[PDB]
Structure 1
Amino acid sequence: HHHHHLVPRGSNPPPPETSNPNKPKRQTNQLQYLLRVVLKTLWKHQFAWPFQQPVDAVKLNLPDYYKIIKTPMDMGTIKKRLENNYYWNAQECIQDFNTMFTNCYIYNKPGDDIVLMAEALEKLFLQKINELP
C-alpha cells in the first residue's frame, strides 16, 4: 500500500493567550515594577533570547517538546500579558516566570547550555524579586 504517513504533519500548538476580556485584571505597583524592572532587565540579558518567544518545536527540531511540556510559558508571552494588563496580581505573573524556568529544568538536563542560561536568568529574577515594592 502506497500510504507512507508522510502527512499529516506536526505543528506547534497555539500559544498561550495574552488577552482575555472576561479575566479579572488590575494595575498594581508590583505589576508595574514587574514590567519596568524585572521583565525589562531580563529581556536585555544576552541569555534571554531562547526565552523571548514560545518554543518553535518545528524550527528548533524539538519534536518531543510539547509531548513533555504541557503548560508552556515564555517571556514574550509574559511581556505581552504585562503590556495588556492581563494579570490580577503580581503572583500570577511570577507564577508564569516560575513555569517558564521549571519547564526548562524538566525538559533538559543539568549542565545543558539552555539550563545554564535559565539558571543565570533565574538568579537575576530572584534578586530583582527581592526588591519588589
Structure 2
Amino acid sequence: SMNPPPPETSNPNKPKRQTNQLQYLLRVVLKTLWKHQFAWPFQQPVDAVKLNLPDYYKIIKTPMDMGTIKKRLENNYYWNAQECIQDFNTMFTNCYIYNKPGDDIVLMAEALEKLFLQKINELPTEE
C-alpha cells in the first residue's frame, strides 16, 4: 500500500482569479486553523506508509488535507469559495469516516471544524 500521488494543487488549464472571499479563506480561515495546536496531523496528506495504515487509501478515495488546501489557495487553483469549503469538508469527513468516534484524531478534527464553521459564518460579501 504505497501512497497515491497527492491531490493536484495547480493546473495550467484551470482558470484563475483573485477575489476577496478567496483572500479571506487564505488570510483568515486557513491561517486560523493552520496555526492551531491541533492542526499538525492535517497539514499534509496522510502518509499511510509511515503511519502503517494499509487500508487508508482503500477506504478514502478522495483524500484531502490543509497543506493541499493552502497550496491551492496560494496558487489560485480555486475559482470560488465553495470549491475551497468543499475541500475542508472532504478533509473532515474523511477523518470521521476512517476513524472511530472516540478517537483523539476525531476530537481534533471536530475542534478544527467548529472553528472553521465560526470563521465561514463571517465570510465577507464579494466586492
User: Where on the TM-score scale, by shorter chain, does this alignment land: which range?
Assistant: over 0.9
Give me the identity figure in percent. 100
- Between the aligned partners of 1:96 and 1:83, the Cα distance in structure 2 is 15
- Between the aligned partners of 1:115 and 1:55, the Cα distance in structure 2 is 14
- Between the aligned partners of 1:115 and 1:92, the Cα distance in structure 2 is 23
Equivalent residue, structure 2, for 1:63: 54
Equivalent residue, structure 1, for 2:22: 31
CA RMSD of aligned residues (A): 0.6
**Count of residues in Structure 1 that have an aligned counterpart in Structure 2:** 122
Per the normalisation by structure 2, the TM-score is 0.95
Deviations 1:28-55 (A, max 9, x none): 1100000000001100000000000000
Moved more, 32-41 or 22-31: 22-31
- Between the aligned partners of 2:17 and 2:51, the Cα distance in structure 1 is 36
**Structure 2: gaps (5+ residues):** none
- Between the aligned partners of 1:99 and 1:90, the Cα distance in structure 2 is 14
Q: SS of 2:110's equivalent?
A: helix
Deviations 1:74-127 (A, max 9, x none): 000000000101100000000000000000011011110100000000000000
Offset, 1:26: 1.7
Larger radius of gyration: 1
Q: SS of 2:57's equivalent?
A: helix
- Between the aligned partners of 2:47 and 2:56, the Cα distance in structure 1 is 9
Offset, 1:25: 2.1
- Between the aligned partners of 2:16 and 2:53, the Cα distance in structure 1 is 34
